[model samples]
Target chain A: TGDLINTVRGPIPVSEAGFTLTHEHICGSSAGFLRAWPEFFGSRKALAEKAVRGLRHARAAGVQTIVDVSTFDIGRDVRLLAEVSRAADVHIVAATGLWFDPPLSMRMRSVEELTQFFLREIQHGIEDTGIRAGIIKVATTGKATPFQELVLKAAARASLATGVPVTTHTSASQRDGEQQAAIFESEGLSPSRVCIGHSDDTDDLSYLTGLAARGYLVGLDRMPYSAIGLEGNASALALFGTRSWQTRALLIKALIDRGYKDRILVSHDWLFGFSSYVTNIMDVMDRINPDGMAFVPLRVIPFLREKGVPPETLAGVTVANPARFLSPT
Target chain B: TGDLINTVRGPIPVSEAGFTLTHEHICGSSAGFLRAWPEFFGSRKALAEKAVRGLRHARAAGVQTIVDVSTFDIGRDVRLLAEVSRAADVHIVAATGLWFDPPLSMRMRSVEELTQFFLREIQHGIEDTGIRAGIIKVATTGKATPFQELVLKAAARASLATGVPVTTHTSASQRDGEQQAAIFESEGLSPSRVCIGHSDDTDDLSYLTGLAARGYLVGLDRMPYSAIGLEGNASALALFGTRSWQTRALLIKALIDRGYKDRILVSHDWLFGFSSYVTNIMDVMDRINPDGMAFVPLRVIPFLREKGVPPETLAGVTVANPARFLSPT
Candidate 1:
């Protein structure tokens, strides 16, 4: 019997192996409205081919499941994701959430109307196709723009209704993780269930630790993207041996020491073709250098290991915990 | 009668200039902590020579005067300043303040005690030497560490007691500007008399404008110091042209246009050789080179002129305004 699935191991028959990068993206197209129109018209075949290629690469890298956190306006290509999932044997976990940018037009009747639209798309087939989203997606920009906040609130409401764990794309423009955590906390959502993305951008350790201290999972992805012309990888590497890294490690260790390891998750936030502006997938891959990109994850894992992070601690952030947080219980 | 002068020019007679950059360190040395052990002790001659060089540089650059804002622990060296001033044909505005480091040892005293010390220094000259300070300098670190805040509050109290304008060095690490401004404002001090230093390190135009709008003069003096890795010059220049610049200019211009021109002051805050660890006399010269640096007092004046800033507007920021604000009359 044919079955529907979306997790990193591109929609396999429920059986897969190895690790899972629980939070990532196939394409990180522009958040602006003008750039989103082309994404809507793009062919599913191209998207599927790109996803299949990404899965083959991930398989070589020992990644079995990939969670695509493109939600709302930016994340509407569900049919192509399903096709890619079936073709690549990588569990593709799709999302449902709102984004920040050419904000949802005012003509959209009401919040209920918008929520109903998302609920229908997520519950029923995305358009005429039978592909289903495995996770709920939401995002906020720059300390949670009002529009983004509303979207997240709606996503939280939808998550309550749909029984799927919610993840969010928080901007790295400022201290977004703390803001995201505060929003989730104020909404009475379990911090463990919401992944606060982009904790690595800001150097505010106290802010990051405060979120982790509050039982929220901090996303230390985006290890490669440069900001304001500074190399993030070099900065992260320097941070590894400094007081800042020690503080971060101690926070993680303290959380594990406090038995909250399951609340942490890690990923690369890799954006592939179709969702990316660059037309050539190979060009994008060359720029990203998936092979060389292993340094960040590898360096982090080794540093954590040296700092006495137990295997279970690693497993919690890398695999089992993400599964627990993301899997339907 | 011949009088001793420092290298940095203050208005020659001390009565010509309006606002003074009270928070500036004309020519000082070392930051954090440097022990005055026998091995580290150096002749004041070299220090005096550098101060003279810096003062000449300042004079040629149109800086009427500078309050050497270095504190007691950082080789206050007021005696050398007096000697250098006598030789350089510039007015030496000295300061009485405390440094931020060295763990606030038992030798250290409370803010009340420090206030008394500052008042005595201002009222009765430094020890037996007849050199006196014109303003009180204070500083706060990132988050205003309790000890640093105490020191700042002490400076404020001393300012209240001695009728001297207070100026401060704010940390460039984060958004400490608003907090520092609020602290000063809450102390019942007139923000117009206070200058918040090193604000150029932040990109928050609203924060800078808010402080300016609150009646405090904002210092964008440290321009073109690539060593510090801040866009001080560019950001300040940005404040001159575009819509954002126009908006800010309107606010400042409204204030100035309505007879608050004397409230604003501009300076290089150039701490050569003895001022900071990395900056030197040449560095200040390099940053102020009109053709080379593209944004110094020399360049700034012409640029503002091109931007339709009247000659009076230039005089308000550079000459008449600073002199008036710094003078007690």
Candidate 2:
């Protein structure tokens, strides 16, 4: 607990971090809209209020920490996180690393240079903002392509240099989370330093446990987003081409039975502020909007226990693992 | 000679290298002026030929290596340096880092981002030219400030990552080189990898030795320009209103006496090409006819030997120290 984790507000002891969610977006926008003036969507002051509404509820639910995995190129105003942290009284660890499709200036650089960029933000503050990033977040589309490899490698090396942990977004359809785990290991960084994120969209148990076989933390994070229609309906098997929570919860129970209890994290990669995503399916998405920010701890965890997943395993996912991941433990 | 230094052409074993000029500007200009179109300032082709003519003479005098300390914001052209290296048949190691009073675009960045700009150049090639920088250089004006401190710290981290050595231009009038050394050391970077540049501009023997005591290399560079007679005085002491070779040489010999033979790197911080300096000294600058380059190995070495500096001392300054500093021995 005495180990300090750098939050957007400032450095704080890790003990303050209770039921930490390792991956989530506090605010974001499309890579294009993100580059333009913020007034196009909303001013930072306006965005901060919108963010606090959701953040405050999560804090009330005993969620003490939320690692805001937003980069500057994707409309990350760190001050937004700082103000939200203040209003919600939550320990928010800000992120530092490129997202997919970086700015034009980033393309001209090398991996070592990119590592330095994250290094400074980790060691010092980002710009004049006194807030320091405690962890880094990097993303890639389908196959972890060439540019994504550079971004991932940069984050890997930056994490190695500083004690900062790293989280990532992986499409389960691409199955590239395995590739990312291999790449991170190749850099002489271990699985303990990274979490292979978004494991819900795939129905492969062997693949999930294969990642768990290594020391890496597999995120059953998208559990809140994986649910759908009535339980008895056979068509509920695939809702908008996503597997059901039952399918995901069963994977978690399998891992627990296998005694891979310590290496897992859960969260919603929710975008509270703003985002312009490709292939918008708002109507299907809005179905779960009723449950909103409180969905993860309130509904998903309870449902897992109802389905015979032990309470201690649920406790490990919610509290212990994330606290260890966020701290250098 | 057994060390390996990264030249813009690629990595070359330093055995092919003999006498070396550790810090020299192959070409440079104001960030603003350099960004303009080709017709604006003589063609790159003509500039390449002009640089080659001077570089050839340096190669002829047992000089096989030249670490060109010209950064991108200061009109650094990797392709031009690559062509010049081929034409002159001299290994030219390119540089990356912000110079004093960088362009406005660079000013808006944090030290972390600036460090990335340098790391990419060192480990990968500059832009897409495939010409990697072997070293880094950052600068400061009369006084080191909050911003320059950030720049120096970035250089500090970049050097530690890639074994690319670092050099700098410090205002002797303000004696800010000590500040640079302290900042680099505080970042856990060894002073051994950095050269406190333009030490010749100041006659403060104690300051030079103090830096040497920290195991940092001091630039007894700017040798040729240190000897110019003022008015009708027989003594060549007022070289641009500063001490001549006599003062610079005496300091070098004093340090050498205390076995600091390996702690010195010599060159001319010669302005080889266009540089629209911040002070706007351009109009009056054209008053003096331009001097051909290769001023360090050709002229500085000869003048130093004539002033009772021994042959082995000359070898250490031009060959041993620079080679060790350029590529770890």
Candidate 3:
């Protein structure tokens, strides 16, 4: 009960974690886009300023902490994280993990070698910044590829070694959440120590029920925008599932009703920036989720409260759940 | 004439402005993409570094000066230009001009208002920096829209008042070059003081022949990439015209053969970076022309030399021509 949550600005008692979004990205860029082409991507300082404004907006809406799950491969800069954490006056829990598309170089690394990298960032601090990551993030497009499995095992070993919890990017549509749960199980990591992410992309209530039933934190992370079709007509994600925001609200209502209040974590999965575009796609994506990290607290909670979900139950989903999920085993 | 060419590092004698590229950009972004979203556009510092590398590469290939035709509306940071110029050891002649699509605010301004803006940047400096613009640039997508004509007239008036030459972005395909030349003539500006840009986007020899026939400096700039189709299959630019690099070379050869050597200025309209696509279009566009600023000197010069064009005549096009074009009245 006295365990502290490690943050970029250092540790804080879990009780003070307050309203938290367990899944969000402070910044994102293609691996080498900034170094190879900064003219297109802009400066990290400028990005930091944008993040400061965003995090400030979230803070004004009562967001106390943000778990930025952007790993090294997806343009995560821990130094920038610390700078932003201090400036925005919000606790930033950075992650040490891998994202989609493990390059052959990463794919070729043994599981032990990869585990060492994750452990160092979590324990020794990322890139000499002494701003330690509080979580380990792993991703899979579908059922894990041989390479994806390698990363999953590494994350499992790192989490076991450090007592920090693990979060994941699982394709809810492909039933990747359960598959990820199984891998962590084989590694002897507890379901209570793992949050299966992007769980709301599917409408199948059974998947959420099953994960929560098995003690996994249900990540109803992709909220409001993709749920409300704000991603516009051309997005593959908008086409992936046509579930309305009301449906997403209902799904969360179901999870809480099924006695899984403490096992649900809600977030917007909003990316602050990305370098994978030739055009202003970030601006387009921004239109999809305009409220950003504040969406759950400022908008969704009111809607859930109106839908007959108790204010305390909503607080449990938004606050207590993330605090408990991030409180390592 | 002992006239000096204005550069970011101050004025230089025309004789020292050897091997010049009359049209190029140090950096590019959507109008508000940097301010409204620098995360997508990236930092000016990073972009300035890229420009330094590019300009240094050009310098290594004997490029003495680059006439950066980027205007304020298109991400032209003169301080960045000065930084990159000094770092790369190349003369940078900044442009006081307008690029494509004038917003209603810019559109609403009178020609007199626009001329004062242009003249202030040329005479005093741009935005509190005493580094003056060497050239005035104006663009039109086709024939001038009502607003486009106003900017063009402003550019003409600025040129006549300041004795600095004017460069133009003309659609060779739409014969915007002739229309632009006529406007300058009516404004009491001579053809010799104007460089009609983007003349290589079309293969029609008469456009080039006619521009030079009127003693206008023909900007045969969109080199090597679009000419060679280095822009990937998805690019609308690749499909615009299928003219090969060899065709671009022959067009230059024709310009020189027709006794317009002194009126020809060749360049690779290589943008350091642009914020316009949702994918890695710059990486693809880069493959279309890998040599970057060196494409004109290292590749095109060799091709033209082999095509029976004398070295002195080629030097006149690359070196003597830009010196003459940038030399103020």
TM-score of each: 0.42, 0.49, 0.52
Between candidates 1 and 2, the DockQ winner: 2
Instruction: Name the weakest run of 10 consecutive residues (lDDT summed) in model 1 chain A.
Output: A32-41
lDDT of 2: 0.70
lDDT digits (tens) for residues A1-329 of candidate 3: 59898998888999888999899988665333343224343556677888899899999999999999987666566777888889999998999888874433344456876797788788877755777889999999887988788888898999998889899998788999888988889999988889988888887888889999998988888776452444355553543356766677677888888888888888888867765332455676667667777887888888889989988888778788887888866
lDDT, each prediction: 0.55, 0.70, 0.78
Docking verdict class for candidate 1: incorrect
Deviating ranges (above 4 Å) for candidate 2: A30-35, A39-45, A226-240, A278-287, B1-329
Interface RMSD, one decimal, each candidate = 30.1, 15.1, 15.6
Judged by DockQ, which candidate is best?
3
Residue pairs in steric clash, candidate 2? A110-B120, A113-B116, A113-B119, A113-B120
lDDT of model 2 at position A20: 83
Report the C-alpha lDDT of model 1 over B181-290, residue by residue, as the tens digit.
77776777778667777665555666666677777776654443342332454432332222232232333444455554555554445553433232133444444332
- Could you tell me the lDDT of residue B235 within candidate 2? 29
Candidate 2, A233-267: lDDT as tens digits = 33333433456656766667777788888878887
After superposition, the stretches of candidate 3 with alpha carbons farther than 4 Å from their true spots are: A35-38, A41-45, A227-232, A236-241, B1-329
Rank by TM-score, descending?
3, 2, 1
